[PDB]
Amino acid sequence: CTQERHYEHLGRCCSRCEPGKYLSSKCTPTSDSVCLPCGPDEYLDTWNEEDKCLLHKVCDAGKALVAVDPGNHTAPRRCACTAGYHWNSDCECCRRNTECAPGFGAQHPLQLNKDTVCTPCLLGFFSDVFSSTDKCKPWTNCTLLGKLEAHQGTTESDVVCSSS
């Protein structure tokens, strides 16, 4: 018999427990499964055969983690690394986002809990700094400074303006 609600015990096709509760008692030959609701800060999000509910992840501030979804008896608590960091599964920690070097800028918009991806500055823009947040700045317009363009700019440096 199907699984989306059933399992097999004493030769019987017993009913599986629904999200929000765990099985307190396996089915006997005379009665079916006794499924009780998850206690505080616990949850099960699938039809199960668990004798205890899963405990919610702690979104430890001390790890630069914050709750994005508080979770409940049916859904797990979801956490994210705070600004400037992204979750790294190898260390299971919030790693500092990588910096884009001069000539490149951070691709926008900046994804929460994801590392910054760098891309080179294209014609008309530059970045002369190491930053994990800044995108390439457009070259200065000398006329706004009341000047003329003495020097063309690059991907790494801004134009040079001079009073005529």
Binding site: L55, G62, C93, C94
Partner: protein
């Protein structure tokens, strides 16, 4: 059958200082936390039945940049497994573990764990508790910070 306990840190009640403290809040009924024929009051695990138990503890310390600078000074991350009589003054050390550490580097994250385990003769009324040096450095995870006991033999 035999008494036992696997207590996981109460993530919501860890003291915030830097001074050694007796941990006074553990879960005993959620996640992997469980207790049987043993009593947990306030960080004190009371033995309800004479016998020889295996006692253990896993303690995880962690620090992240966003929490502030790690002051350039003495850092010794320690755990002491202590035994006290529910009616006899000063506690005594059963087990000790830890390490002096320097977490001044420029790394975003620092992590360290200690584990201790031993076979002890306990009497009903005696209590087992945990002391740690830097409470604000404690990792709140159930798989990280915890202690337990299980009886293996009668007296």
């Amino acid at each position: 059958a035999q008494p036992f306990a696997h207590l996981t840190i109460n993530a919501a009640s860890i003291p915030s200082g830097s001074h050694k403290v007796t941990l006074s809040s553990w879960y005993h009924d959620r996640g992997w936390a469980k207790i049987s024929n043993m009593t947990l009051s306030n960080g004190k695990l009371r033995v309800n039945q004479d016998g020889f138990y295996y006692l253990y503890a896993n303690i995880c310390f962690r620090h992240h940049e966003t929490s502030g600078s790690v002051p350039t000074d003495y850092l010794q991350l320690m755990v002491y497994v202590v035994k006290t009589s529910i009616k006899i003054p000063s506690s005594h050390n059963l087990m000790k573990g830890g390490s002096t550490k320097n977490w001044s580097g420029n790394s975003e994250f620092h992590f360290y764990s200690i584990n201790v385990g031993g076979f002890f003769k306990l009497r009903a009324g005696e209590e087992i508790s945990i002391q740690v040096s830097n409470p604000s450095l404690l990792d709140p995870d159930q798989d990280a910070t915890y202690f337990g006991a299980f009886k293996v033999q009668d007296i």
